[PDB]
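Fold this: CS1 fimbrial subunit A
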Amino acid sequence: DPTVDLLQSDGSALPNSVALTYSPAVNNFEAHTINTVVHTNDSDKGVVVKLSADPVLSNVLNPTLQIPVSVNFAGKPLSTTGITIDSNDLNFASSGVNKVSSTQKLSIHADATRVTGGALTAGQYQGLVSIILTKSTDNKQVEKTISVTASVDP
């Protein structure tokens, strides 16, 4: 049983899969935004949020061909270095014996203007976004895995 969790704003589990939408006019992907809430067993503590790895989407036929992914949470960019979101900025409301934050935006941003390992090729790209959350001052990690897919039009 985790001390903290990240759920959708309706109380459902975070999606474990996201398919991004391509926009041919700009040769890039739309941002994908998920409305979320933080659950905690201590409303005096904040949360530390990071990625377990730099997320990238690899072309399924040539995984050397890679599209970098950016992830923002609560209006802050995430990286492999943890950031702390103070309890005051989460606006925790009492839900039974535990506490739930106001709605926080989680956004996934594949940037096809910065493809590496070759040029922008049509077809399918895949990668994982792996988000790690801990309560401030605690070490117990909760990991959210999101399998991301994205097709470039051609």
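The radius of gyration is 17 Å. The CA atoms of residues 31 and 109 lie 5 Å apart.
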